[PDB]
Design an enzyme around this catalytic site. Structure first.
Site, mmCIF file in Angstrom:
data_model
loop_
_atom_site.group_PDB
_atom_site.id
_atom_site.type_symbol
_atom_site.label_atom_id
_atom_site.label_comp_id
_atom_site.label_asym_id
_atom_site.label_seq_id
_atom_site.Cartn_x
_atom_site.Cartn_y
_atom_site.Cartn_z
ATOM 1 C CE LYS A 36 -11.927 -11.633 4.018
ATOM 2 N NZ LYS A 36 -12.662 -11.564 2.727
ATOM 3 C CG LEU A 84 0.479 -14.779 5.200
ATOM 4 C CD1 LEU A 84 -0.446 -13.614 5.538
ATOM 5 C CD2 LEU A 84 1.443 -15.043 6.359
ATOM 6 C CG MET A 85 -2.468 -14.849 -0.642
ATOM 7 S SD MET A 85 -1.632 -16.111 -1.611
ATOM 8 C CE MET A 85 -1.571 -15.275 -3.199
ATOM 9 C CG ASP A 133 -15.709 -6.795 -6.955
ATOM 10 O OD1 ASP A 133 -15.444 -5.988 -7.897
ATOM 11 O OD2 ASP A 133 -15.652 -6.494 -5.757
ATOM 12 N NE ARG A 137 -12.675 -3.584 -6.047
ATOM 13 C CZ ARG A 137 -12.926 -3.113 -7.278
ATOM 14 N NH1 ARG A 137 -12.046 -2.302 -7.842
ATOM 15 N NH2 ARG A 137 -14.049 -3.408 -7.929
ATOM 16 C CG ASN A 138 -11.705 -7.862 -5.181
ATOM 17 O OD1 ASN A 138 -11.445 -7.312 -4.108
ATOM 18 N ND2 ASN A 138 -12.825 -7.619 -5.840
ATOM 19 C CG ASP A 154 -12.808 -9.611 -1.374
ATOM 20 O OD1 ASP A 154 -14.069 -9.743 -1.447
ATOM 21 O OD2 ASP A 154 -12.214 -8.891 -0.541
HETATM 22 C C1 LIG Z 1 -7.403 -7.724 -0.037
HETATM 23 N N1 LIG Z 1 -8.451 -8.734 0.053
HETATM 24 C C2 LIG Z 1 -8.668 -9.551 -1.140
HETATM 25 C C3 LIG Z 1 -9.222 -8.829 1.129
HETATM 26 C C4 LIG Z 1 -10.051 -9.852 1.516
HETATM 27 C C5 LIG Z 1 -9.769 -11.215 1.201
HETATM 28 O O1 LIG Z 1 -10.693 -11.958 0.831
HETATM 29 C C6 LIG Z 1 -8.444 -11.866 1.497
HETATM 30 C C7 LIG Z 1 -8.388 -13.272 1.585
HETATM 31 C C8 LIG Z 1 -7.217 -13.943 1.856
HETATM 32 C C9 LIG Z 1 -6.067 -13.187 2.060
HETATM 33 N N2 LIG Z 1 -4.778 -13.607 2.331
HETATM 34 C C10 LIG Z 1 -3.986 -12.502 2.460
HETATM 35 N N3 LIG Z 1 -2.672 -12.526 2.689
HETATM 36 C C11 LIG Z 1 -2.074 -11.340 2.734
HETATM 37 C C12 LIG Z 1 -2.720 -10.077 2.560
HETATM 38 C C13 LIG Z 1 -1.916 -8.820 2.612
HETATM 39 C C14 LIG Z 1 -0.535 -8.850 2.800
HETATM 40 C C15 LIG Z 1 0.222 -7.693 2.822
HETATM 41 C C16 LIG Z 1 -0.382 -6.440 2.625
HETATM 42 N N4 LIG Z 1 0.375 -5.245 2.682
HETATM 43 C C17 LIG Z 1 1.728 -5.105 2.131
HETATM 44 C C18 LIG Z 1 1.857 -3.789 1.394
HETATM 45 N N5 LIG Z 1 0.531 -3.229 1.110
HETATM 46 C C19 LIG Z 1 0.626 -2.064 0.229
HETATM 47 C C20 LIG Z 1 -0.151 -2.881 2.361
HETATM 48 C C21 LIG Z 1 -0.161 -4.044 3.331
HETATM 49 C C22 LIG Z 1 -1.767 -6.406 2.404
HETATM 50 C C23 LIG Z 1 -2.506 -7.578 2.385
HETATM 51 C C24 LIG Z 1 -4.082 -10.096 2.277
HETATM 52 C C25 LIG Z 1 -4.745 -11.326 2.224
HETATM 53 C C26 LIG Z 1 -6.090 -11.775 1.982
HETATM 54 C C27 LIG Z 1 -7.289 -11.128 1.704
#
Ligand SMILES: CN(C)/C=C\C(=O)c1ccc2[nH]c3ncc(-c4ccc(N5CCN(C)CC5)cc4)cc3c2c1
Length: 275
Positions: A36, A84-85, A133, A137-138, A154
């Site tokens: 991030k 990583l998710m 929140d 989405r989170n 998030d």
């Molecule tokens: C969304 N969010 C909640 C944002 C801020 C966060 O705090 C946060 C913290 C840790 C995180 N680790 C992650 N590991 C993968 C992703 C991820 C992987 C793949 C996708 N794609 C696939 C298909 N999709 C429709 C379109 C792209 C999107 C996100 C996100 C985070 C993540 C976010």
């Protein structure tokens, strides 16, 4: 909590691989990671927030809350390194994974996502943390397939503590949007809305209502109808999370118990999803 516990990762050990969403990148440190980034063009408040987010996540230890790997804050742009998710956000996942006639998900899968997030919320509640929140989405998924684990991702909204029209009012109880009051019971209400999001397979709450109409509707006692094909036991959890008075809403121990009962009822888990 001190910056002392925040593991600083030398920037030279970090490589960005690809963008993921508008920002978060996939990264490597060979440990694969979500990165991030704090914009270099950022306000003074934005910087302290970013540091706040890292402290906050770093103090939690739970399977259903994303791990913080470390930070690289002594270099610009500033990075937080997170678990990583691969499955991505739960909202996109439910939309993309909707059964279609040319076709995945079952009721037990939905219940396991719900259970995972409730377990995360129970941990936050017993550690006196108010997320503020909880929404699909989170939430994030470890992977798309049957072994998937949902986690709360998030921690930005909790860390904020913007304007009126930026409030996630569709996820907020009346005392939150009317009085700015936030408690553990706020997150219970939000969890109810997340449940609806899950069992609707990623619809927007209050379909075709605007924020102001939702505000008036909810204040007047109005509640969403069950998502299509939603089992009664699941809808009943939602309507309990949305009791008007916070003291009438269940805590997360109770919610978890009720979700677990749902997973044991064959009539619930044998319900087909709509196509
Ligand atoms: C969304 N969010 C909640 C944002 C801020 C966060 O705090 C946060 C913290 C840790 C995180 N680790 C992650 N590991 C993968 C992703 C991820 C992987 C793949 C996708 N794609 C696939 C298909 N999709 C429709 C379109 C792209 C999107 C996100 C996100 C985070 C993540 C976010």
């Amino acid at each position: 909590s001190s910056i002392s516990d925040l593991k600083e990762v030398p920037r030279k050990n970090i490589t960005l691989i690809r963008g993921l969403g508008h920002e978060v990148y996939e990264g490597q440190v060979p440990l694969q990671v979500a990165v991030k980034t704090l914009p270099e063009v950022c306000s003074e408040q934005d910087e302290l927030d970013f540091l706040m987010e890292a402290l906050i996540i770093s103090k939690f230890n739970h399977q259903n809350i994303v791990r913080c790997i470390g930070v690289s804050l002594q270099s610009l742009p500033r990075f937080i390194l997170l678990e990583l998710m691969a499955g991505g956000d739960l909202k996109s996942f439910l939309r993309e994974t909707r059964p279609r006639p040319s076709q995945s998900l079952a009721m037990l899968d939905l219940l396991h996502v719900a259970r995972d997030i409730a377990c995360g919320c129970q941990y936050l509640e017993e550690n006196h943390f108010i997320h503020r929140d909880i929404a699909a989405r989170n939430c994030l998924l470890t992977c798309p397939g049957p072994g998937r684990v949902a986690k709360i991702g998030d921690f930005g909204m909790a860390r904020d503590i913007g304007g009126c029209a930026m409030l996630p009012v569709k996820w907020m109880p009346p005392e939150a949007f009317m009085e700015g009051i936030f408690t553990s019971k706020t997150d219970t209400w939000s969890f109810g809305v997340l449940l609806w999001e899950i069992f609707s397979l990623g619809y927007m709450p209050y379909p075709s209502k605007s924020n102001q109409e939702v505000l008036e509707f909810v204040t007047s006692g109005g509640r969403m109808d069950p998502p299509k094909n939603c089992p009664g036991p699941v809808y009943r959890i939602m309507t309990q999370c949305w009791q008007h008075q916070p003291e009438d809403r269940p805590n997360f121990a109770i919610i978890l118990e009720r979700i677990e009962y749902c997973t044991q009822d064959p009539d619930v888990i044998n319900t087909a999803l709509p196509i």
